[model samples]
Target chain A: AMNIKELSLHELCEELKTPAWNVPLTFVGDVGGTSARMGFVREGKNDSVHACVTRYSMKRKDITELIEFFNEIIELMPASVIKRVKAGVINVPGPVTGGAVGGPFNNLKGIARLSDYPKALFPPGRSAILNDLEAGGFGVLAVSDAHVFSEYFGVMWEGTQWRTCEQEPAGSVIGRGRCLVLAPGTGLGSSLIYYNPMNQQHIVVPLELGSQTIPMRKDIDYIQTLHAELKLLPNYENMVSGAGLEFHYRQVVRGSRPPCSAGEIAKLASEGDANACKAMKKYHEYLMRVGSEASMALLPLTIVLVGDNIVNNAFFYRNPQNLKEMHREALNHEMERLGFQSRVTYLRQKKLLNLNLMGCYRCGLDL
Target chain B: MNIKELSLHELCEELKTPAWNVPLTFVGDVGGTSARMGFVREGKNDSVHACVTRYSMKRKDITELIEFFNEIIELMPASVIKRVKAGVINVPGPVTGGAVGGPFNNLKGIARLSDYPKALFPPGRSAILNDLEAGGFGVLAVSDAHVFSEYFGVMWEGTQWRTCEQEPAGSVIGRGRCLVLAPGTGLGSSLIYYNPMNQQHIVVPLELGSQTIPMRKDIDYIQTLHAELKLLPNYENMVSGAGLEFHYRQVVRGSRPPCSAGEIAKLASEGDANACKAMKKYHEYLMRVGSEASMALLPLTIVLVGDNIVNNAFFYRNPQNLKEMHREALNHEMERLGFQSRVTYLRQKKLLNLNLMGCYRCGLDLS
Candidate 1:
């Protein structure tokens, strides 16, 4: 039997339905080395989401593999039903900043740059590729509470205003300022949103300041050494991302050394291990550092955290030893010390398609 | 014709208003180091009141030397009426940061760095502008009736406020939100402001992130280069302050291989035919790098650039062509692309100082 999950192949017909998917429906695929999960996006409703799984290794090394994979998953759906689909979104593990750089999709292929993919391999229309975090950003945007961001910095997303403030440099000086976006995913992905006063529109820009070295306390360096031993010489990615928890644990708790795995450390922490406690404390402290760095980097009034690390971590939400606590501590400092009047919110992730398609759609409609 | 400046003894007598000349007056001193000037508060006015000098320097650096210097300067007084005056002003370079560090005058040596001489630290309620720009800012405040302070990563002067807008991590918040400060004289300093949301205020719980490696773009690489060059392969001061300018001029511009004297190579770029062109281009690249750096680091509404390299053409301003022009050009692009409604202004040095002080004074009075 073709499981009901098989019906998602008919997304072309599914997306254009009544109300036109209020928030709009877009396809998402988080392609890991082993397998890939495909899903649909809808606004406001979470349960409306659907997903199908496929083996990534089974496909050929060319775009044909992707086509074959999709075909096999959605073979039950009629061709007419699928023809209307216009875009497909794919996320990669490594950096896919932009341009035609090839992606390393495990040992399965050599260098399959985004541009190398065939047209049909996507939907009948257009397809786009972005870093996994970016896709996650779009997902967050589709469902995020509009009031979440105040300011941010980016390259393509520069001076972008996400919410409202006195937008400047280009705006009429009559409206609120630009909106900022910060996503602490694979690495720190920052962008800005500026509202055009003349045209009465919005603009976004992106940036790559994440690779810049952030201040790490001396005490943490010893811990980082343990991280280095683990083959993670520069622990920035591990320290700031979901895996960051592991790095923090290594630094704070392991004075001379760290456990072989985060699970082992988590076990010790739960069992009242002193090293575990120290690690937790240090992790919390690093979280504050990251928060401060981000605030300084983008000057965002609101920070929306996306990515598997923060999403799945219970500590980030509400915990005695988690990122949320670290954030609060840093926020208070901003209040009593630096005099920053800003707000931060956590926007949960919901599977969604790239909003860029919608942006393109909006542009196409105007034309 | 009394052409000689005041003798050290005569300058001391002049401090005793009753013993010598003019009525008590407001004395002002502009320091080369401090951003603002220092002054003696007027009588009947609360010493802390607004009518103070904007150009005060650390009077403690050369208490005795100041007396000696004063002995020479007091000779500038051509008339008996000008001698022994309660009102006197002097600006010096390399002043102390604050009174907390040491006494204003040293009773011992003429150039004792530890304390100030009696003549240097007159007893009539004195203020200090350890930084020259701070003195300029003070002048602006006094003349314009205002107050202001910019936050980069730290606060060099002025005021700050804290307020949070949206979600709080409930507990662990670090340095609130944003920090503000501006660059003046030779470098940039920051003053952090905390968010004020009636939430608990916590101390800044981390080390100085700015002090870490990567002071420039590949901080680690720079450090590596420094280490590698330590073998008497060079008698260099290592890459720092002005040294960075030289590096850009020589290595990046000249494209020379590693050698003994980095400075020699840098100096060669000045007038030498072989290296000048390359160094000039490199200078431009470096300034742009610095400008982009400050922009990305703070992500401010506007960036104010003053310091020597940017304001004075002799160093890195004109030869390279990136300093103000590049910053302004980017400003234009930022506006045209609507990346930001307005990317604030990067004014000339003196003007920025005046504006900042004016804003600070305004803020002080309003509060």
Candidate 2:
């Protein structure tokens, strides 16, 4: 009998095949507030999932430049490959509305409309845009079976975090079938994915979590002060995002020194600066609380850590001792306190790459 | 295509005559705190969606109630119904591993599957789920345009105030999917992503209301007073029924004689200054819950079905008061966070019974 565990990408794809006439597809992933990536996938047996072409930094460019960059990449590809491109999927940093990107764009500039993409790239009406988190969801499917099988959770990030929130223990893993993604970066981003047994696929929804009122811990004087300063309307973004770091610093340091970026502050903390360490410690504690609350609030099978600040920064990853110390704190202070026992992983390298491109490709395949 | 409003009976009737062997299925909706059960007839079309004769778990055993219910309802072909199919029951708790029940369960008796009646429910014939899961299914099963329209947001208040988070619109609604539910009291929020493509919903419950919230100048004194009283300053302490009464006595009246939550609301409406200010703040906090949940869950709609919010005087009679207290601040926050136009709120008339209907929906989905 077909069981719950049978809902695998390989098995699902068996029923999702199309004719050879639909050969090439384009996949684009945009994350953080600064970068956009493009890749090409040709539909066929043993075809590469995606071939990376170039990565574009949107620091000084707008939507037009980003589109021009893609057009240039397409023109350089073999002409035969271009002719067979049937569909495309692009992932952007915000919620998608009417096939156009909506919500805050974070660090990126312009390019909110799906129509802004150059017309020559794909067939008319054959392309779609999705929130980057949704693309990360599809990317999970493209991950190596071994990695995905070993754990029940996956996290893909640049600007946000997404994880599995499946409640039922259908297979060997507990709460393995659904997905929940949350971002505590530039803003508080969250989404949920429903695993469909019949269609053997997932449906993703991007949330407006950043706009929610930021909760406070009474023990945290800085939070209480920030809440008063913000007129009691403080939100998650005000306390947990990049801007949140600044607010925490302002409250803790009280303008004793010049203001600096979150990265610089983290660097200062490494030098054992008391003020910097205090700010960072509070940041981690706030993060641990937010993460634990989200985990408890969503109760996912696994928790995934995304974004550079929490997962890739020196404060969390550079030194083995620092990592171990923080992990123990998270385990005891956050995880154990909230009664969360699920696996939490930070995606990197090949898995991260595949996650960014997979959603767009899947959008193409679905088309 | 059928417009999204056709009643299930009408839709089924269009499918022609049914020579069905199975005629009925049983469903019960039990939660952490508590009511009703129902029978779903296969084809007669006069399906009993909810039974008027309600059963309360706090007063009796589930098995005795089930037997008594069956006897009174003349569900006499009980043996036949059992042979045809096992029934489904929903509890306001998590489903445990292997066993029929799990943790976070607040209901007094029948903690495990072994506690169930063998004669009432066939082994493995019946299934159990968290109450919120059944509620999500009920939300989906509801075809009434007014009940489950464009966006569904929920708000319920009784011992505590609770509501589903307001989320930005995404594929869930765009592609006919759905998410999240919050039962009244203690912020028992759950996220559910529905895939219309295969009619599956993945649910994860969250305790969002219990999380501590930022301090408010309007209510900062309440914190100091609460602390002097050695009470925790959390969302529940300000928004729940018990919290409202506590605030009315401690913060608003400065240790005056105790009064019920409803009486305080009545006093506020009757032009008591301190009572009015306290109630206004309560309204603000309620909106804060809506705003926060919207940002976290990012659903197209939220359903409000509990007594605290639904029965509160300010919700309907004082729309202007609500608008004045929250509209500008909420709009400002959402715009600042770039999620201004993402949520719609739904107020349910029949609160408790909806869960019973949801139980029927759960059983129907299972069968």
Candidate 3:
């Protein structure tokens, strides 16, 4: 009924100027299949900003129901802060084409299409829909200039514990060149973001990295064993995502221990559970393999890892002593073998929450 | 020494402004293995412009080589024509920090960007790109019919799969999704997808050919061969010019000795058993590579570049050979694997070196 409308930053800016209202802007940031978040940010006259966020752990609810929940919460906001609703920007999982959004291993159903929505929920031509990775791409801009980048190198053993430093340090710019962002959650989401000086715009290139088959090393016996058992092919997400790990522990590891969630397995691994440790170790290798391949393809300046599978799992970087040295050595060998020099780092889950919401707010402000 | 200069007027003059008043551009397509240069005038009064003469590289310094070439060609512009407008250089190497440096096959030593003669370019008016990236842009410069006509087919009636040609409407223009492939000394590929909302092209330079592909269970020989050679099996090693010879020697073992690709193709066409068998296998390999790439990129159209693929010697351009190489049954395998049914393949028969044409397009895109 709304003619499948799509608006760019300039178009939204035009609408904002005409009959502009003084009200807090609503921003939606949806990442992975488990949850969707909405928040309101008020820009102060003195260039300050304030935000409050709400999240929904999606079950069988479709997009319409999710929108209804978001609407009910917004309507209950204090009248002082709800004089008028200015604009809204929604960043959902997966690629956005003509407002249609569908991601790999998505949890919601029958609501992937962005059109045919209620017009009252958003101002005409004032809302923008973008891929979740694109929102992450913009999120990097919200970080302070001093803390956006740091020295993260994979090197041969220095005669001690194999140290792989994955941190957000100080004194570098963000996305100066091509930067690769990967989030292994419900699925593996990857995007390459770079700055186009000619256009003064950020270019975000979403990849089907999870769906494409990548080769597993023949020398790795565990991988071979997994393949023999599950008849698994080379889908990156199938081996690296949250559900992927859960399935791996149950089927590939063939452990007698009770099946545990990926998060639970992470805790068990840190507590020295043999079965859990093996599963997480295998996941670490698969993640490194994907990262090496990506480095060769993109030659990115920085690689940012996010999502629960990576951030919460002790097998990856949560522990400094267990498998850290082996992981570092393997990553160094692979990067050297592939002739790539991208720095590896991680974005903690806590910081990611703020950045995602700020990304949505940035979208509204950009208009 | 020339401050890496780039400018408009000098470039037009160097390219020899044509009889038409439109701006002229100089384009260079320098592979790590081979070197080529060409020029083209801009579209004037809505009339299409064609490429001028192309030049081969000589074993001399950059300035001396260009001077010798200019002296021999006797390039003269009409009195009415003014200065050249711009220049774009596409070199085979990794461009890092605005500097290009990488190994090359034909050059006596590694080639670097600073080695080029800066006096020949305009100050701050020229652009440099990777050869593969140039090939992707070149796809954009081809004629509409050559880019949008027929859906690509992979058919295996019973014994083997070969590419099949099918006529279709020019729907690629409206979709604005394209994949470019150039399989010469090595396999070079890239992708371009357009945003319908902003009408902006998102170009992704894919290093797909070099990444190791998962080995199928049926390809029993690959596992043993890879282990024996200590080499990973990749698309480049299975689909490029050298790849053809490598596979023939390894699989056929010189049973029907042919020194050159041309001889093999000719013999295959003349009903030589071993040569025919080798050619059939080669075709099958190419189709698989294309199918895998299409599955990953989801491009509506594929632009084939490079001499090995576009020349009359290959099955790509010849209708008779297309049918001889393909059987209807082979198409089903890829179709059932979720390969899109409505994908088109366009061959650039005339432009073997698309990198040069892509350079010209890059110039126009920037201006």
Candidate 4:
């Protein structure tokens, strides 16, 4: 829950899983607390912007690396394409004000503001800035090729009885209402897509879902103790997140067992290790608990789950059996208990490298 | 959580503090379980719809009433205006498929489906619908009136933060996003005002924010006995009037006598320890919902309306002790997610018949 500020530059990019897409320059990126996912929008035939996403790293309290990373992209750009760019958009993890920056990000501390960085590269007025989740939210709308989001699970009202995605098309079943894009990556993130009936406009609002204080998972002794161990109030991320999965596994194996990475834990769980699978169970539990509560406010008609954690194939969310047994059953139970029956969807992790990049691309084009 | 099928005609009448303005034909907020109908005055046109209920018809009453109405509509002079026509019926429950029905209950046929009560309306024009959505318009009604019985909390005053007791400034009221998380029976009556710019009375009913009540051992005392928690455990268990009684019983736990939620509210007003905690817990739940909605949706002005807060404003105002816990809960949610500056309005009065008023307002719109 506390803004994360511990990773080394390499560690940050590692969490992103390094999208190997053939790509970028005239760049757009999403710099989260841990890493920066950057990509290029190669404008082609009739001003169409093609997204080519990838990433870079930022050292603690330093922007020189990020600035150098920015220059490096331009250096690699084709002369013809480079002439057409005006530095596009670059979203940051922290809240932004005016345009590109605000409230000082821990990710790029000494630089003071991200607004200065965008101006450093491109001409004034062409480049825009957005909050990270804001970009991810817009990405839900901007995406199609890579399926950053799709109508994944649902139930609907038809004829005389209740029907589900098995019988009806998702968008048709969802009809018209607010949509939610819930991102559970290194930190849990959220944004809402609300339809303004008056003008048929869609609006996006960024939410600090990860920062909300989560009740201690008192059902587990380790988790209850983990709450006391944290020194500060446990935020939603403390219990259900990428780093949280690591801590959960470490704690289950005795508080200070030299934590395995969230990735490593999943790999071990893949081998059916009881200790690893045990924590996997808790991680999925936390996911449902957090997702259900986070989305309660908007009661979105459609839901899109994004971020690296969900995309990780070894995890419970990606596998069909695990999804049904652990996820959908528990997910529908909590959501239905509150009378929320939204069309849940997932983003295909291939082709479209990162949502924020696509979102930033959309914001750049102002389309 | 037990909904009196009819929202109670005399009950709403009594709660209106007995308007006693003299009255005539009917309209109501009916559910599968109860129905409360009230008569609209025949003429003397004014904005207010004067109403009274007719449950089971008595022969003499029907005979005289029918004769009088038949002749009244036919022979009444112009000064009286036209006899009331179209009748409106609303259910205080989740709505579906352009009709009203139990969210899961078997109360179909006349109680839920398309069948309207013939006794109340014109053959072809009768309207039966949902009331929670109407309550939102009632909010728009009361909001414009600004008859705030009481208010607390600092709000932006253009120059500086000031204690506000007035409806926020015009522009502040215009902030497009509004979140309504009022807790009544089961937190079932929930709504959100999409925008004030369109000045549209458009409202979206949300049946959420009542997710599983994850208990923290420190102060949670009642989740165990409410074993139905398995089927349905939610914030409603803590925030609703019915939930207050559960907390009251657990706090006293045989060491003291149990009491109704109202008695608990009154006793807490007098500084009784058990009653205070019982009452405090529900307030905390409100703050939790408030914080969640406020943080997660970033609503500009959050409208919190309910009979619980209105009736028990005394205990909170006298908050030398209660205020500490009140704020403690507030901070629990605020700091938990990080505080977002919002024009938070804890509507303190005039909302006793929100469902009823909303019903009338909606009927006006339709007719």
Candidate 5:
């Protein structure tokens, strides 16, 4: 049986007989390399929506596999959904250019003309595909709860004494501004979003930050060496993702310990293993660096950190000291010199599919 | 000196006698060190209407500046602008969190406030935008003539490519996206994103100047320059006009003495040895981050603007400039990164001050 998350009893009931603004049911899906998460959504006024989700293994790769995959999804959905689902949005990893899987997925060759797999899913122009990070950004902008953002980690300055002020929530903007969502897991994903108070619309822009060349200082040459060995270009992704955690760990121990997964390293660090702790610290340092770089480039009201790694290892964000560390690293001397500041916060994955599906729902409605 | 085009007389004439639909309002553009003002109205023909006054203010204090600005406006032709009711001012600092230290430092609490005073007949209807982002808004309003592809040296003629109004318009264009890099008293960047589905245009402001960048051959030089500071140096340390002087100082290192960014630019154009060396080095670093930021956004066009690069403008526009620093070096990296983004310098014959245009544009009903 596939992993599935049903709506709360009350929510399901509310959806079944909605009295609010009437809208058609929409299909939403987030596809990853190994698995796919599928859902259906009913959007309402003020850009509100609820969705139910199911996760299934993605075994095959070709058009036929896509057909087989959706057939199962169609069968599993409620019979009522079959007739009302006239629009859909699919979220895929990597770049989605001109409605096709471009960029990193370019080698796949005509792999995803998803909207036209026999046109029965949705009419030709009604279905759309978007970058996963962009979709996450849609969710990030949609949810603007003040409490959801963790505390303001560090103090902001006034003059040179770093004049202190009352701290506020992470993502609170005075008016319409921007939010940056960064996820570091198997790869580093980034998206910048703009909120318009005049129109109450949020726009998300996908970033290719993963493609950046990692600047090598004296201490971090190992990351460059590691990327070279793997026949990959050195970038923020190879330096901070799950693989980066493992490689940095193996090198920190200097081969004294066997290579382990990111989860194992986190587990060992929690137990105060000397080498493991050192590797984790280094990972945070690089993570802080990458985050700071992005913060500088995109002066978002809040830099929201999410993804599988952040979801699993909550210690870094949960611990006040660690949060302060991340804060100080970004609000260093340079930011003070220019009187600039950044607020960073986190979001729990909570299965991760909810946010992705919410984003897909928003996308589906726009169509 | 302010007007870049010869049509100023006609533009000025039209502004005074605007049609009934043209809503007149005050517009202000604040920089790190100066201030400019203008007026905007939407005409029936097509584009937004604008006329900028060549005014500069060094003394801050929002109220006093407003008084002087209004005093200047008092003498304006009654036929063109009868009673300016509202205003919009784009600021150089981060508008998100209290105008972070610039020309309008003291005006911190004034922006983003609901009880904003009607002292200038603007509090109720006015808006504020980040200076860099304001430029982006101005850029999006412009036609194909003003922007050009860096390598191709062709402008987008509404439909395709043309060389300075020469040749036909048609080419396999990349995304409708563009990246704008403005390095002035400080360095700032903005993005013009075209959402694939609807061609929706979104401009995001970036503080990339403060973002740390990857170095190629100047690691030691960079470290030496920034060793005194408590934090690691960033792109702004080497890419801004002030950064130009600092870099020249590091290059000379007490050999003679350091010069201002102005002197360095003037001397470089005259082929002074140290000036050219430092200028080239500064440009190299600029291009380094340009490529990096370009990689981040993967924009189809990179619009280079602002005071620093403008000082020695030919350095970038000249064919020999890139060849000298091995812009080939950059071209190779970009080619490897794979997207051939159009690099272009914005040049307008009649219109001047993008920030002014941007500020005026935002004061309109559409924004």
Candidate 6:
């Protein structure tokens, strides 16, 4: 066995590197439930935000499958490359549901845990696995740009002094002094990580908003209808999951047309079928509803859409245009009605085909 | 036909003194579409943000309609007690589509520019038509609390602070800033208001992200796919509309379920054999693809669910222990990832139902 490995993604990235001279180099790999990726990093130096990444399918047979594939690449290597390498870091699928620690081949053994290749290849060091999503947090860390912001709505600039008044659009305020993270992949996961100015370090808190209530207050009727329609009278999962898209569609069409699956509806609309056409329109409406509704809880600077969920869409211009429209209208409308303007922004998951790999290699094994 | 009258939801609640006291109160119902609200603030206050707000909907004459409603309501003064003052405002469906201006209705008989009419309504009475959603900014300034403080990610606890300076989650380290909003109903509206504090609030010019291949340095595959969709697929409506559901069903399922609609599928998911299968299939389709689309956007927080805090279901505690489990998981993920610096927080729109009304009415009557 690979003697249970435990390392941060960054360390893992270092272990896999080809050393040159005195530089402690690493060839890091970040793996996720869905894919694998490789990168190079200079040991003892700051990990580069812009990394070279490659993606592979998650349904492969085993770890050796890629090892065998990589053997043929014959990339540049140094004599000291093999000597400093040991241990492997990987991010896996599903929660590490069992064990005090993820594994010494505990769960999802299909990964590097089951292999002795780490010590076999390095003749030293050890092996361990880390949750790939955690590594994603690391990836997220490399990209976000933030600033101190105070958002107070309904306040009037009177004589150069702010005055509080009442009426419509007069009683809510959103002040920004926090940050959040939404990790998406096999399942929707969220976390709130913040930097403590005192300690000057980052503090991460896992988020569970995924199973929270549907986003829109006005659409509770529609949500309940969806739940009852799905025999889920009280399950928020029915509305928050990827499946929620279908539920939204069903609501729009009601019983007007014959039952259609999401795919069929897409095809029909693409092909210009009238009913399908209408269904597609309804789907966008619902998508916007759900997206906008989710906004109430986040007030986030950026709502990062992760996992394969975002990949299926077209160009950025065409992306979420309807939902974008809805968000603007809903926020402003809600402000008028509720009396506040929230300062929240949309953030998409960074473009990394193999985040799992980047995460594992960057933070799991190294950090 | 009665010119749909405007009333303050809160004021209505307040005037229980055996008499409805319109009190020259301002009124508005600013929503995604149709911002109709006005008060004795004197007259219509339509401005740059209230163009279609007034005239888009089918209306004959506001003066006549008000006269008719007042005549009927005034007749039963004892029955209605309130002063029965009135003002009206309108908001467009696609609120963010374009800029609005002036009053929607032309002076029916006013000739020439000056004879036409004063664009500002309410005259000197202090009454004004608010730009429903736009007014939300005002409301945001009024009430709401900061749940957290400056949040950012990337670890720095260990030492040397080497790789610890990565992008903080929702911080200057990782994601960019965005302000998102949603208004649900006929056509759900979404808004992505980018924060340009650094740039003096000037709109940033943007060209096609795909057009700039230099930006394609990362995730060429996704960019390629985006290009493919632009050339080979028609996905705007399907990807971002209420019509998405139909598209998902028809295109993805290949066959409609045995039943005629979602109701049947819901019933089936409970125990209906055919419906269950259809429902499951529908679920699977959304799960498979929806997740991917969410991830593609790369938001720090996608905020897709939208504003659903006031939902009745929120009051009903989740029985599946889902909330507890998710909350725990969220905390765990955050802890494990070592992401602590936060720059944003989840701020709720405690009460805007009243604010929007006033703003809309103000805008509508101003002109």
- Prediction 4 TM-score vs. true: 0.67
Report DockQ per prediction, comma-separated: 0.04, 0.34, 0.30, 0.20, 0.42, 0.01
Residue lDDT tens for model 2, A162-248: 232333222223133345555556655555554432233446655555555555444546556776787656666676677777766
Q: Alpha-carbon error at A15 in model 4, in Å?
A: 30
Worst 10 residues of 1 chain B by lDDT: B152-161
Worst 10 residues of 4 chain B by lDDT: B152-161
**What is the per-residue lDDT of model 6 for residues A1-367, given as tens digits with 9 covering 90 to 100?**
0011233444533544523324432344555444566544333334333333345554653544556533422233344554544334444443221101232121234434323333433222333344445445544543332110111111211110012111222112211122344443334555443332112333332333443333233454665576566553322334434455456556556566566665555555556466554544444344333333333322233344454444332232143553455355435323223222243444443233444444444442433
lDDT of 1 by residue, B1-367 (tens): 0111243344445444542333222333333433221212222332222123222234534343344334434543434323212322333321221121111212222223224433323333222322332333343333233222221111011111122213221111122222122232223322121212122211111111122232323335444445544321111122223334445444454465443334444554366544444344333333333333333332222233344323333333342433344443243112232222212222233333332342233223222
Angstrom error at residue A136, model 5: 1.6
- Encode model 3's per-residue lDDT on B1-367: one tens digit a residue: 0011223334335444344455556566665433555455645354444343334456522333345225423444433123445656765554443334333333544433344444324435556676777776665555333643332222222110112113333323334456777766667777776653365665566666666655544346566556654676766667666666765666566565545666666666676667666666666666556665654555556656676654534554456556643432124223453344435555554434556666767777666
Give candidate 6 misplaced runs (Cα > 4 Å): A1-82, A86-88, A95-133, A144-177, A183-186, A197-201, A213-237, A240-242, A247-299, A311-324, A328-341, A349-356, A361-366, B1-367
What is the DockQ score, from 0 to 1, of model 4?
0.20
lDDT at B20, model 1: 34
Candidate order by lDDT, decreasing, is 5, 3, 4, 2, 1, 6
Q: Model 3: chain B TM-score vs. truth?
A: 0.71
Q: Candidate 1: which docking quality band?
A: incorrect
Best by DockQ: 5
Better of 2 and 5 by TM-score: 5
How does the DockQ of candidate 6 come out?
A: 0.01
